[PDB]
């Protein structure tokens, strides 16, 4: 009831997030988003195909949340990864979370998208020309 | 690139979202404050912000300049509202799209405290404790 963690393929989207973590007792809520970007240093993309096996993503997200609150405290987290075929300025992640406070807030969604980036068992696949080719990065 | 507002209309993040997201920027970062109850151990009812509106946006003009001075290239969306604001109402809303997401992150987290000292923005919390404005 406090969490929110979703693999899905349908269009992220942050006032969905702002829905669920905004109440009155947090002051604050700070949000990531990753969206597929264009000319990624000196290479044009078209578009990237992201694979997540829903259970074992989501319960990595559910970890991270968890492991945020025990780094920062009371906290309602929002995390969502979109899979599939990307084309640019599209979201790929959405990271949001509301504390009472302004600094937990923002801590934790600094820890989250850096956590995530390294835990999340995400394939993706980027058609910069050179042929199909998955990559957990 | 840079989007500087005092209002007193409801602030926006998918508004913030639509300028900000552009194909070369695969990062963005976003602060919302609002109003918080209970506060300090008591209920709050509403919070009047009362600001030097063109002040004001001059000081977040000059924020962004000083973002990217330390952050590099940058889109920056910032927003605050004026009136008396019931819980849950956002005050505030930063927001801030780079190439790549630590800029975008940091930079963020640099407005929203550098805009906390500098912005010509007077609050009173209707805390029950009388009246009492801060330049918080």
């Given at each position: 009831a406090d969490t929110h963690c979703r693999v899905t393929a349908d269009p992220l989207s942050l006032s969905e997030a702002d829905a669920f973590l905004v109440?009155?007792?947090?002051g604050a809520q700070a949000y990531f988003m990753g969206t597929v970007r264009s000319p990624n240093q000196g290479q044009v993309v078209e578009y990237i195909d992201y694979e997540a096996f829903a259970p074992m993503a989501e319960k990595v997200m559910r970890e991270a949340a968890a492991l945020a609150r025990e780094r920062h405290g009371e906290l309602r987290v929002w995390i969502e990864h979109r899979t599939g075929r990307l084309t640019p300025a599209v979201a790929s992640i959405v990271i949001g979370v509301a504390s009472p406070h302004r600094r937990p807030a923002l801590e934790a969604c600094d820890f989250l998208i850096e956590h995530l980036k390294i835990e999340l068992p995400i394939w993706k696949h980027e058609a910069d020309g050179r042929g199909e080719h998955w990559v957990k990065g």
């Open positions: 109440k009155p007792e947090y």
